[PDB]
Each structure stands twice: as C-alpha cells, then as structure tokens.
Design a protein around this motif. Structure first.
Motif, PDB file in Angstrom:
ATOM      1  N   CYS A   1      35.558  34.260  55.214  1.00 52.79           N
ATOM      2  CA  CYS A   1      36.782  34.251  56.006  1.00 52.79           C
ATOM      3  C   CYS A   1      37.294  35.671  56.231  1.00 52.79           C
ATOM      4  CB  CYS A   1      37.857  33.413  55.312  1.00 52.79           C
ATOM      5  SG  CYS A   1      38.475  34.135  53.758  1.00 52.79           S
ATOM      6  N   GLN A   2      36.385  36.639  56.167  1.00 55.21           N
ATOM      7  CA  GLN A   2      36.744  38.038  56.363  1.00 55.21           C
ATOM      8  C   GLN A   2      38.017  38.386  55.597  1.00 55.21           C
ATOM      9  OE1 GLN A   2      35.405  40.334  59.885  1.00 55.21           O
ATOM     10  NE2 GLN A   2      36.102  38.523  61.014  1.00 55.21           N
ATOM     11  N   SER A   3      38.188  37.767  54.434  1.00 55.59           N
ATOM     12  CA  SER A   3      39.366  38.007  53.606  1.00 55.59           C
ATOM     13  C   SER A   3      39.156  39.220  52.704  1.00 55.59           C
ATOM     14  CB  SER A   3      39.678  36.774  52.757  1.00 55.59           C
ATOM     15  OG  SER A   3      40.501  37.111  51.654  1.00 55.59           O
ATOM     16  N   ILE A   4      39.324  40.409  53.273  1.00 57.87           N
ATOM     17  CA  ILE A   4      39.155  41.646  52.522  1.00 57.87           C
ATOM     18  C   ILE A   4      39.879  41.578  51.180  1.00 57.87           C
ATOM     19  CG2 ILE A   4      38.854  43.062  54.576  1.00 57.87           C
ATOM     20  CD1 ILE A   4      41.801  43.917  54.232  1.00 57.87           C
ATOM     21  N   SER A   5      40.857  40.683  51.087  1.00 60.41           N
ATOM     22  CA  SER A   5      41.628  40.519  49.861  1.00 60.41           C
ATOM     23  C   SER A   5      40.746  39.995  48.731  1.00 60.41           C
ATOM     24  CB  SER A   5      42.800  39.563  50.093  1.00 60.41           C
ATOM     25  OG  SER A   5      43.517  39.333  48.894  1.00 60.41           O
ATOM     26  N   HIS A   6      40.421  38.709  48.791  1.00 57.75           N
ATOM     27  CA  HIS A   6      39.583  38.084  47.773  1.00 57.75           C
ATOM     28  C   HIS A   6      38.106  38.193  48.143  1.00 57.75           C
ATOM     29  CE1 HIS A   6      39.928  34.288  50.386  1.00 57.75           C
ATOM     30  NE2 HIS A   6      38.676  34.705  50.456  1.00 57.75           N
ATOM     31  N   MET A   7      37.246  37.629  47.301  1.00 58.86           N
ATOM     32  CA  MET A   7      35.808  37.664  47.541  1.00 58.86           C
ATOM     33  C   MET A   7      35.275  36.270  47.851  1.00 58.86           C
ATOM     34  SD  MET A   7      36.740  40.368  45.689  1.00 58.86           S
ATOM     35  CE  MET A   7      37.242  41.347  47.102  1.00 58.86           C
ATOM     36  N   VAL A   8      33.983  36.188  48.151  1.00 57.82           N
ATOM     37  CA  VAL A   8      33.350  34.913  48.467  1.00 57.82           C
ATOM     38  C   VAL A   8      33.122  34.086  47.207  1.00 57.82           C
ATOM     39  CG1 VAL A   8      30.970  35.698  48.227  1.00 57.82           C
ATOM     40  CG2 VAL A   8      31.511  33.808  49.780  1.00 57.82           C
ATOM     41  N   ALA A   9      33.158  34.749  46.056  1.00 55.94           N
ATOM     42  CA  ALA A   9      32.958  34.075  44.779  1.00 55.94           C
ATOM     43  C   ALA A   9      34.221  33.337  44.344  1.00 55.94           C
ATOM     44  CB  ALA A   9      32.537  35.076  43.714  1.00 55.94           C
ATOM     45  N   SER A  10      35.375  33.874  44.725  1.00 57.92           N
ATOM     46  CA  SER A  10      36.653  33.269  44.371  1.00 57.92           C
ATOM     47  C   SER A  10      37.238  32.501  45.552  1.00 57.92           C
ATOM     48  CB  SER A  10      37.640  34.343  43.907  1.00 57.92           C
ATOM     49  OG  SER A  10      37.325  34.795  42.602  1.00 57.92           O
ATOM     50  N   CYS A  11      36.845  32.896  46.758  1.00 54.02           N
ATOM     51  CA  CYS A  11      37.329  32.248  47.971  1.00 54.02           C
ATOM     52  C   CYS A  11      37.520  30.751  47.748  1.00 54.02           C
ATOM     53  CB  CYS A  11      36.351  32.482  49.125  1.00 54.02           C
ATOM     54  SG  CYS A  11      36.979  31.955  50.751  1.00 54.02           S
TER      55      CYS A  11
END
Ligand code: ZN
Ligand code: ZN
Length: 63
Positions: free
Chosen positions: A35-45
C-alpha cells in the motif's frame, strides 16, 4: 504476437529461479510494497492480513 518482459526478478536479493514473494530472506527496509505505506512495512501491514475470506460482492458502488 511476440511479447515479453524486460526481466522481473526478486527485488530483494536478486533470485531469478525464485520469486520475490517465494523468497525467504527478509524484505529490505524499503517502503511497504503493498500500500506504498512508507510508514509501516509489508510484514506488519494490517491490510495484507485482512480479516474476512468472504469474497462475495464487496459494497458494489461508484465514487
Ligand atoms: Zn530473493
Ligand atoms: Zn502496507
């Protein structure tokens, strides 16, 4: 006709045999590749692990 890809390989380590997804190694600290969420990562997304296997029409609307 004759079409193909320039060469899509694991954008993590550089494996051609396996796919970035299949790969086991840890995903670079880069931005979330979901989700291009520079905030969190794909592991926690959270979205990634969305709850609800129900796929029978999801609020069909426009706008
Ligand atoms: Zn890899
Ligand atoms: Zn995300």
């Amino acid at each position: 006709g004759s079409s193909g890809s320039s060469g899509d390989r694991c954008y993590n380590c550089g494996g051609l045999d396996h796919h970035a997804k299949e790969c086991k190694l840890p995903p670079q600290p880069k931005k979330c590749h979901f989700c291009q969420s520079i905030s969190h990562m794909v592991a926690s997304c959270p979205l990634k692990a969305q709850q609800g296997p129900s796929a029978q029409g999801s609020g069909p609307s426009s706008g």
